[PDB]
C-alpha cells in the first residue's frame, strides 16, 4: 500500500523544521496529492488525445497546469516545473 507520507513529511521539514503533522492531516495531504495528480494527468491525457499525439510530454503537463491552476499558483507551478526539468536534463 503506497502513500506520499514520507515525501509530504520531507517537504514539511523543509518548510517548518520543528513542526509535525497528525495522522488525519497526513491522510488529507495524501488525498490532496492524489486528487491533483489525477486532475493534471487526466487533463494532459485529453490534451494529447485532442491533438492526435500518443506521448504525454512536459509540455502537456505544463499546459494542463495552466488550465487547472488559477493565476499565481499557475505561474509558480510552471516556474517550478521548468526549473526542475532543466536541472534534471543536465
Amino acid at each position: 500500500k503506497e502513500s506520499y507520507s514520507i515525501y509530504v513529511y520531507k517537504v514539511l521539514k523543509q518548510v517548518h523544521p520543528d513542526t509535525g503533522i497528525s495522522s488525519k492531516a497526513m491522510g488529507i495531504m495524501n488525498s490532496f496529492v492524489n486528487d491533483i495528480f489525477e486532475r493534471i494527468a487526466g487533463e494532459a491525457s485529453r490534451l494529447a488525445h485532442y491533438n492526435k499525439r500518443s506521448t504525454i510530454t512536459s509540455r502537456e503537463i505544463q499546459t494542463a497546469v495552466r488550465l487547472l491552476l488559477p493565476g499565481e499558483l499557475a505561474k509558480h507551478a510552471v516556474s517550478e516545473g521548468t526549473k526542475a526539468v532543466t536541472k534534471y536534463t543536465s
Binding site: L12, H16, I21, K24, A25, I36, I56, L73
Partner: protein, 103 residues
C-alpha cells in the same frame, strides 16, 4: 543516484512515472513529463503546508491538524478556487457570521 535528486525534488519521480505508465493515460510517457508533474505536486504540497503550518502556529500547535488545512485552503482565494468542490474531513468551516445577524 535517484531521478528526484537529479531534479532537485522530494516527490518520487520514478513512482510518478510508473503511475503514469500504469494509469492508462497514454501508450507512452516521455522522460520529462513525470519530473514536471512531480515538481508541480511538490510545489502545491509545499504551499499548502506553508499556510497550514502558519495556521498551526497561530493556534500554538506544533502539529498541523485538519482544522489548519481548512483554514489554509479557505483563506487563500486561489487554493479555495482549486479545491472549491472538496470536503476536508474534520475540517469544519471558516468562522463567518453575516452582518445582518449581528445586534
Amino acid at each position: 543516484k535517484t531521478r528526484s535528486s537529479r531534479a532537485g525534488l522530494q516527490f518520487p519521480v520514478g513512482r510518478v512515472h510508473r503511475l503514469l505508465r500504469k494509469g492508462n493515460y497514454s501508450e507512452r510517457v516521455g522522460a520529462g513529463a513525470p519530473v514536471y508533474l512531480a515538481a508541480v505536486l511538490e510545489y502545491l504540497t509545499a504551499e499548502i503546508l506553508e499556510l497550514a503550518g502558519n495556521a498551526a502556529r497561530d493556534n500554538k500547535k506544533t502539529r498541523i491538524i485538519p482544522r489548519h488545512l481548512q483554514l489554509a485552503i479557505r483563506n487563500d482565494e486561489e487554493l479555495n478556487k482549486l479545491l472549491g468542490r472538496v470536503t476536508i474531513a474534520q475540517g469544519g468551516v471558516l468562522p463567518n457570521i453575516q452582518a445582518v445577524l449581528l445586534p
